[PDB]
Design an enzyme around this catalytic site. Structure first.
Site, mmCIF file in Angstrom:
data_model
loop_
_atom_site.group_PDB
_atom_site.id
_atom_site.type_symbol
_atom_site.label_atom_id
_atom_site.label_comp_id
_atom_site.label_asym_id
_atom_site.label_seq_id
_atom_site.Cartn_x
_atom_site.Cartn_y
_atom_site.Cartn_z
ATOM 1 N N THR B 6 27.710 -34.905 1.905
ATOM 2 C CA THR B 6 28.238 -34.228 3.351
ATOM 3 C C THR B 6 29.558 -33.857 3.073
ATOM 4 O O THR B 6 29.798 -34.342 2.347
ATOM 5 C CB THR B 6 28.243 -35.215 4.190
ATOM 6 O OG1 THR B 6 28.032 -36.570 3.655
ATOM 7 C CG2 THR B 6 27.414 -35.092 5.408
ATOM 8 N N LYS B 39 28.663 -40.928 8.118
ATOM 9 C CA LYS B 39 29.128 -41.417 7.041
ATOM 10 C C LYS B 39 30.638 -41.775 7.045
ATOM 11 O O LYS B 39 31.299 -42.084 5.929
ATOM 12 C CB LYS B 39 28.740 -40.469 5.471
ATOM 13 C CG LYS B 39 27.274 -39.847 5.660
ATOM 14 C CD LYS B 39 26.791 -39.548 4.323
ATOM 15 C CE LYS B 39 25.274 -38.963 4.357
ATOM 16 N NZ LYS B 39 24.778 -37.963 2.900
ATOM 17 N N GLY B 51 35.619 -42.637 4.883
ATOM 18 C CA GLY B 51 34.255 -41.911 4.739
ATOM 19 C C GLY B 51 33.683 -41.750 3.357
ATOM 20 O O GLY B 51 34.671 -41.726 2.124
ATOM 21 N N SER B 130 30.320 -31.432 0.103
ATOM 22 C CA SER B 130 29.735 -30.191 -0.003
ATOM 23 C C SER B 130 30.736 -28.786 -0.089
ATOM 24 O O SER B 130 31.181 -28.057 -0.995
ATOM 25 C CB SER B 130 28.541 -29.818 0.888
ATOM 26 O OG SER B 130 27.465 -30.962 0.564
ATOM 27 N N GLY B 164 31.753 -24.863 7.509
ATOM 28 C CA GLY B 164 30.301 -24.782 7.960
ATOM 29 C C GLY B 164 30.063 -22.939 7.947
ATOM 30 O O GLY B 164 28.861 -22.512 8.292
ATOM 31 N N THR B 170 27.262 -27.176 4.865
ATOM 32 C CA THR B 170 28.113 -27.830 5.820
ATOM 33 C C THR B 170 27.728 -27.179 7.070
ATOM 34 O O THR B 170 27.538 -25.929 7.505
ATOM 35 C CB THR B 170 29.493 -27.436 5.640
ATOM 36 O OG1 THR B 170 30.035 -28.151 4.635
ATOM 37 C CG2 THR B 170 30.189 -27.568 6.921
#
Ligand SMILES: Nc1ncnc2c1ncn2[C@@H]1O[C@H](COP(=O)(O)OP(=O)(O)O)[C@@H](O)[C@H]1O
Lengths: 408, 180
Positions: B6, B39, B51, B130, B164, B170
């Site tokens: 993540t 997370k 995290g 990522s 993202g 993402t």
């Protein structure tokens, strides 16, 4: 007999354990919840269940001493067993009904010594009757008046006052004796050979027994290191077991021993430790539930220290003065060193690893290494121990981290 | 194949301390199983942000060994950071483990790696998983550029956001955490 009200119990605490009020509190609430019982009947004398205590928190802030002391003023017999021990991961052989067996072995060399100033001062006036008897005998046939006995004293009690200032003469007095010795000996003797007549059958036992039985207090230290939650602090549940074994103790059994069969039943238990590794939630349920009363302690301060350095009645510091005085030295700690004194503890404990109040002890005896040594020289001389002092033998030490590692 | 990292981004600006991460769970090459996962946790009486990147077993798991060792030393990240590394580097099962750990406090900020590295970002921005780099590139970018114009909290939010946007692995649903 003892009791004390809750607060009473506390207050004598705050006498030698700075802060952690909550702590104290509980332990006393256990120790009356104790008394209370007795005062019931038979039904409930035996259906109510020593309110055993779980002592969650950091190290050196006083779980142990809170117990240690509570017990001394309970005047309970007491022992602290490390939990570890029963593990033997070296694999020996540990049995847990031992514990109870040592809570008797003090419950004795406690009954004993706590009988030689109760019955000592009762028999220094019985070791004299045995020398004012050999220096001048009360001539045959005592014509009963008890007031023609203080009437031997017409010279006899002139020797009685003369026993404190002129001795070392050669005499012989009455499995008895018939023995020819000397007087500074013999004086140190009779005493001993007289505590015997101060009856020691089924009394120093039976009631020593009563000791334990009535109650002391066992402080099972570290309990947390004996229970699972995996990773770094689980090998097997070849430790879980020691929680099990334990059970009975706390949960209520008889036990075999030396001076007499003992009943754990009503003994009080105080289970310690810190649980950075698990969580009390993590005991065997069985245990979990014999640890009714749970309490936290929290790490002490700098202040807390300062205050442990002086507001303890046995104070450390004082330990110094007096110790130190003995060589002819007054010593006197400023507000403002007692400040750095602490200040250091705290700084040191924060760099290497922190061991609790513990550090003061070491920091100190180190302060003094200078004074404490040269002391027998200072014959009279007096010294001012204060910040500016402190820091001269401290700062670089505390400075040197890696030294401190060794020597604080 | 495997589940993808993540993305998670921590940043520390004008004394605010912040951690954003995506939710996107990208399974296999291309497949997406979930769109939300936590997370980013708060550790130690909201005193630390942490995290992780990885599996929530691994995740949860590391986390506590960081706890344990944080108590085990009364607030010293660096120290505990390290002593975890040791622990992680050595353990058979986590030493092999891919992802890293972002830990930060009121003060300061650390990368902590399966491999026993422990890293300190000169500029108060760390980033894992990522799109890492993409958000890293957003982070460092904004701070340098609209430090005044934006916040801690904000800058991090946005990191992820940009990620993202360039990044397949993402996704838009961001979790955000800060200390006080
Ligand atoms: N809260 C405190 N008040 C007074 N003395 C303390 C306090 N905490 C620790 N000490 C003293 O410093 C040392 C720590 O006590 P101890 O009870 O054995 O530590 P712990 O139970 O926390 O492992 C002992 O010498 C103790 O008497």
């Amino acid at each position: 007999m003892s009791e004390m009200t809750p607060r009473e119990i506390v207050s004598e605490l705050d006498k030698h354990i700075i802060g952690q009020d909550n702590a104290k509190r509980s332990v006393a609430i256990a120790l009356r919840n104790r008394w209370r019982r007795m005062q019931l009947n038979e039904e409930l004398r035996h259906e109510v269940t020593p309110k055993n205590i779980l002592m969650i928190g950091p190290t050196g802030v006083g779980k142990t001493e809170i117990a240690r002391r509570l017990a001394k003023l309970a005047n309970a017999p007491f022992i602290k067993v490390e939990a570890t021990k029963f593990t033997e991961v070296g694999y020996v052989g540990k049995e847990v009904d031992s514990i109870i067996r040592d809570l008797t072995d003090a419950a004795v060399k406690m009954v004993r010594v706590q009988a030689i100033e109760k019955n000592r001062y009762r028999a220094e006036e019985l070791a004299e009757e045995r020398i004012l008897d050999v220096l001048i005998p009360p001539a045959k046939n005592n014509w009963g008046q008890t007031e023609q006995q203080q009437e031997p004293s017409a010279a006899r009690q002139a020797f009685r006052k003369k026993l404190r200032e002129g001795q070392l003469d050669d005499k012989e007095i009455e499995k008895q004796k018939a023995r020819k010795l000397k007087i500074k000996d013999a004086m140190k003797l009779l005493i001993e050979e007289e505590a015997a007549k101060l009856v020691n059958p089924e009394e120093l036992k039976q009631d020593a027994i009563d000791a334990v039985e009535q109650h002391g207090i066992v402080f099972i230290d570290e309990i947390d290191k004996i229970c699972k939650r995996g990773e770094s602090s689980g090998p097997d549940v070849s430790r879980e077991g020691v929680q099990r074994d334990l059970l009975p103790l706390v949960e209520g059994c008889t036990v075999s021993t030396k001076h007499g069969m003992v009943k754990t039943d009503h003994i009080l238990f105080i289970a310690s430790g810190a649980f950075q590794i698990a969580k009390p939630s993590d005991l065997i349920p069985e245990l979990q539930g014999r640890l009714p009363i749970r309490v936290e302690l929290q790490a002490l301060t700098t202040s807390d220290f300062e205050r442990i350095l002086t507001e303890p009645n046995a104070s450390i510091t004082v330990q110094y003065k007096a110790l130190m005085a003995t060589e002819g030295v007054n010593i006197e700690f400023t507000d403002s060193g007692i400040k750095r004194i602490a200040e250091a503890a705290w700084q040191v404990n924060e760099s290497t690893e922190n061991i609790g109040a513990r550090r003061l002890h070491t920091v100190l005896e180190r302060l003094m290494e200078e004074i404490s040594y040269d002391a027998s020289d200072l014959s009279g001389q007096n010294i001012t121990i204060d910040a500016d002092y402190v820091s001269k033998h401290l700062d670089a030490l505390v400075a040197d981290e890696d030294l401190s590692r060794f020597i604080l | 194949s495997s589940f993808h990292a993540t993305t998670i981004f921590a940043v520390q600006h004008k004394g605010r301390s912040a951690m954003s991460g995506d939710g996107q769970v990208t399974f296999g090459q291309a497949v997406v199983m979930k769109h939300t996962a936590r997370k980013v946790r708060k550790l130690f009486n909201g005193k630390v942000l942490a995290g992780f990147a990885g599996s929530v077993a691994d995740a949860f798991t590391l986390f506590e060994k960081f706890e344990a060792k944080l108590e085990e030393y009364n607030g010293n990240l660096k120290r505990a950071a390290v002593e975890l590394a040791k622990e992680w580097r050595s353990d058979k099962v986590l030493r092999k483990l891919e992802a890293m750990l972002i830990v930060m406090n009121q003060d300061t900020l650390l990368l902590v790696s399966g491999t026993g590295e422990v890293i300190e970002p000169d500029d108060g921005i760390l980033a894992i998983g990522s799109g890492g780099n993409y958000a890293l590139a957003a982070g460092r970018a904004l701070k340098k550029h609209a430090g005044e114009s934006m916040s801690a909290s904000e800058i991090a939010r946005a990191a992820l956001e940009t990620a993202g946007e360039i990044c397949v692995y993402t996704n838009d649903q961001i979790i955000l955490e800060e200390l006080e």
